């Protein structure tokens, strides 16, 4: 009976990740009419075309000068030696006028993406963050209302009701004519997905009792890893975003075919300090885990192999966490895992020349360190806390976590313009600070 749950988890997995494949930024330069005619007339080499015609000149910096400028000259009606065409028209850099790119952009890719189709390249670069912001806002708004809708009609109709919109919205997004409809369909699809996956979690975990719940708590990570791995194969044979979206949508279609309370929890001065430390590490780890994947998906030399390798090293983290639960206290693995995350980034900021060989080893270590630190919190939660039925307090806490997750893409993307290695300092600071707070957890009054 686990096949259904595994399929549902593997279908949910690409939703939070698909921005890596659906939208990517290839190397571009805007179109200047008059160079293609000269290229075909004089037999200009295509590889060396961007050496005598590009306005970026020096590759260092020049983000605006290379991708958002043109050498506005009279390419036609001009006689040239067909060696250095600009050696006589201008005879000097910065002594001839520039301007904004007008006709369009020429991209270097065999496939297509959202950036290529809608031209979010020069001054609309901030429009790409709306893609994740709308999904996170839908995740935020879906938590509050999913409880109310399931009461008046029961859980039988709700589960079937919310597994059809997730496919219809995907198909319609694959058949979208303009940009705003994509955002509307993205929000409508993200309203219900987290609630569906959360309901499936409990539906799968109903049968498992003591011990069995722990054993099946890792099968739901194994299925997530399997779904993450199987997505890299589809993006290799379908290099068009419409085709990939239509190929990952229809599976779901065929798939469907006195008492404990938050009041007692806070007045006691010993159970009040323990939770303000446990509900902050979760926020920090979620922020780091969300940010690292998006950072990797923007500066990867070869995206297909790094993404494949970043799960075969995430697999043994659960095994290590399950190994180290019996013979070792609960704060040493947490402290070590939180310390391993900061040092990885602190070294990543400093390896310039031979970074390509060492990144696939260091980032895997960082991913493993983050993966270990999340399972321990869940195990402690299961061990120590009772069975709360359903609480507006937990609902508000999840809403606040989604509020925190909404802001992250803007800071991740828009802070990289000032300096390339600036977002890798906040992560290190958060990781190093989250290791010094876990040392206040042990009770110092009469511990022995």
């Amino acid at each position, epitope marked *: 009976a686990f096949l259904i749950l595994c399929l549902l988890s593997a279908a949910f997995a690409p939703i939070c990740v698909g921005i890596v494949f659906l939208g990517f930024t290839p190397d571009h330069h805007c179109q200047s009419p008059g160079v293609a005619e000269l290229s075909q007339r004089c037999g200009w080499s295509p590889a060396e075309e961007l050496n005598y015609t590009v306005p970026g000149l020096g590759p260092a910096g020049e983000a605006f000068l290379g991708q958002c400028r043109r050498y506005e000259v009279d390419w036609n009606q001009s006689a040239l030696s067909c060696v250095d065409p600009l050696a006589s028209l201008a005879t000097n850099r910065s002594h001839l006028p520039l301007g904004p790119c007008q006709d369009g952009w020429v991209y270097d890719t065999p496939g297509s993406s959202i950036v290529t189709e809608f031209n979010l390249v020069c001054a609309d670069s901030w429009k790409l963050d709306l893609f994740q912001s709308c999904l996170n806002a839908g995740f935020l708004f879906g938590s509050l209302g999913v409880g109310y809708f399931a009461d008046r009609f029961g859980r039988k109709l709700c589960l079937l009701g919310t597994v059809l919109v997730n496919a219809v919205s995907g198909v319609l997004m694959a058949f979208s004519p303009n940009y705003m409809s994509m955002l509307l369909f993205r929000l409508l699809q993200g309203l219900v997905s987290k609630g569906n996956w959360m309901a499936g979690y409990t539906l799968i975990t109903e049968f498992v009792g003591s011990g069995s719940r722990r054993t099946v708590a890792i099968m739901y990570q194994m299925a997530f890893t399997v779904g993450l791995v199987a997505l890299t194969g589809l993006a290799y044979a379908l290099p068009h975003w419409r085709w990939l979206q239509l190929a990952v949508s229809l599976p779901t279609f065929l798939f469907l075919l006195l008492s404990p309370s938050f009041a007692d929890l806070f007045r006691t001065p010993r159970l009040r300090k323990r939770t303000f430390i446990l509900m902050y590490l979760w926020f920090t780890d979620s922020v780091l885990y969300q940010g690292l994947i998006l950072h990797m998906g923007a500066t990867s030399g070869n995206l297909y192999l790094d993404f494949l390798y970043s799960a075969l090293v995430e697999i043994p983290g659960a095994f290590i966490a399950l190994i180290t639960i019996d013979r070792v206290g609960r704060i040493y693995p947490m402290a070590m895992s939180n310390l391993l995350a900061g040092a990885a980034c602190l070294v990543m900021i400093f390896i310039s020349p031979d970074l390509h060989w060492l990144n696939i080893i260091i980032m895997c270590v960082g991913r493993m360190g983050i993966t270990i630190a999340i399972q321990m919190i869940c195990l402690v939660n299961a061990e120590l806390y009772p069975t709360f039925v359903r609480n507006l307090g937990v609902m508000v806490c999840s809403s606040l976590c989604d509020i925190g997750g909404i802001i992250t893409p803007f800071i991740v993307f828009r802070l990289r313009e000032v300096w390339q290695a600036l977002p890798l300092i906040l992560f290190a600071v958060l990781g190093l600070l989250a290791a010094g707070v876990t040392l206040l957890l042990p*009770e110092t009054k009469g511990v022995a």
Partner: nanobody
Amino acid sequence: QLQESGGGLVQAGGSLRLSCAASGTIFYYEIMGWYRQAPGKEREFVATIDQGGITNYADSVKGRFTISRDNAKNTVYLQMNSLKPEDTAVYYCAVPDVFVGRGWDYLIYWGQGTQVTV
């Protein structure tokens, strides 16, 4: 506030039931256990239980002792059958500290226990 009960005298291969009474605050958010004094020796370890229901046991007493949790009476039970002659000591109810040590050898509570003999 921990309080133990039960105890008595047995001849050979008997059965008796112990009981640890909690306060209500420590019942839901803590972990309970049982420790054996073993006079003339350091204190021993028997079994634990947590909120999920996962139980641990000692190798010497495995297959003989059974621990169960009761929610209506706010008590933690322990059943001992077919007692060996070595099983003779006073038994303490304790609340171990998970975050420090090996997880079951640091105590922050006790209840002074009760005596049993064979």
